[PDB]
Amino acid sequence: DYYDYLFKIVLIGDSGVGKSNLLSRFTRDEFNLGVEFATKSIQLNNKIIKAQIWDTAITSAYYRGAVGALLVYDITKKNSFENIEKWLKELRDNADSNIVILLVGNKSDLKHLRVINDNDATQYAKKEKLAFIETSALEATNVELAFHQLLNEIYNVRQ
Ligand SMILES: Nc1nc2c(ncn2[C@@H]2O[C@H](COP(=O)(O)OP(=O)(O)O)[C@@H](O)[C@H]2O)c(=O)[nH]1
Fold it and tell me: Which residues does the annotation say bind GDP (predicted)?
């Protein structure tokens, strides 16, 4: 270590969408076919940020101190996208008002099984005033893009 800043980030969404593998891809560049956390440091002006990222298999305790979150669904499972409103609600009830939130559609490699079209997801994100990006934890597609967008925006909000 040295790190100038510790940013707590929470992953939230239905079981089976890819949260634990988003965590393992970003922090240790690995994929696998109660509550846990992992860390990874990035550098900007030479300023070093330690991302402390969480997921679950304590709601007040889980959200406390979080400065960012990824809201995650599965682009192949309609129910996971419908359930995003509920997870956003739980987040709003329990998180700091200045928390930075990003919508993520995972499993983008399952091209032929898509049920959620990207314009419909973008429409929802804009309504909730969030950025939206599609990822593949399996193929690594856009994983660094999603986490770095989140971390740089938290730094800007903080500064
Ligand atoms: N094809 C594909 N499968 C994935 C992807 N991400 C996760 N999975 C698989 O989907 C299942 C659930 O993922 P997991 O990380 O355990 O979901 P969680 O319950 O949200 O933590 C596992 O069998 C993963 O290997 C992905 O991007 N593409």
Answer: 16-21, 32-33, 106-107, 109, 137-138
Dihedral sign (CA 131, 134, 138, 143): negative
The domain ranges of the chain are 1-159
Domain 1-159 in CATH: superfamily?
P-loop containing nucleotide triphosphate hydrolases (3.40.50.300)
Task: Tell me how far the alpha carbon of residue 21 lies from the centroid of ligand 1, in angstroms.
Answer: 6
CA distances from 35 to 43, 48, 55, 61 (A): 27, 26, 6, 11
Nearest CA to ligand 1 atom 2: 107
Which atom of ligand 1 is closest in space to residue 31's alpha carbon?
25
Residue nearest (by alpha carbon) to ligand 1 atom 1: 107
Experimental determination approach used: X-ray
Q: Are 107 and 18 in contact, with CB atoms under 8 Å apart?
A: yes
Cβ–ligand 1 distance for 111 under 6 Å, the answer no
Which resolution in angstroms does this entry have? 1.8
Contact of 72 with 17, CB cutoff 8 Å: yes
Ligand 1 atom closest to Cα of residue 14: 20
Q: Which residue in 83, 66, 64 sits closest to 124, CA to CA?
A: 83
